Amino acid sequence: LEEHYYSRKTCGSGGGLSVQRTGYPQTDPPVFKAVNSFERAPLIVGDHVH
Amino acid sequence: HSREVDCERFIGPVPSSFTDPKVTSAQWKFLEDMADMKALADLNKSLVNL
Amino acid sequence: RRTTCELVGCTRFYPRTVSPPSGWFARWKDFPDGSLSEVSGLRRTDIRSV
Known about the structure:
The structure is cut from a larger assembly and holds three copies of chain A (50 residues).
Chain A: E1 3-5, E2 21-23
Antiparallel strand pairs in A: 1-2
PDB class: membrane protein
Keywords: Type IV pilus, membrane protein
Entry title: Type IV pilus from Pseudomonas PAO1 strain with PP7 Maturation protein
């Protein structure tokens, strides 16, 4: 999106102001690719000493 | 006009240098020997509190 | 054992000089005039032994 004021003026007569607001959807490249992974071993022997 | 740009999209891709590292056996052996030497030297300081 | 691979980067904004039209007149209004964001990464792969 990008709004703009197309303030156009008439010829050499009267002289009235104007705004004329209009927008246009603007594209853009994709967003980053967040990666959050993690791997580990399950469980082998529960002793605390060895 | 009035354009709005997002910083989470106008950025290049990730380089190909983000792969896993590659270490040889000699470097691993040297690191293991250095770690063993450091561990053996640190143990001598623990006995100072005799 | 452990193998780390850190990554860091920065980003800046370098806009063009001006937008010269065919035979009209234009002008810019406000601009970043600074940094934007900062990208960073990290990798870890450790293998314990007995």
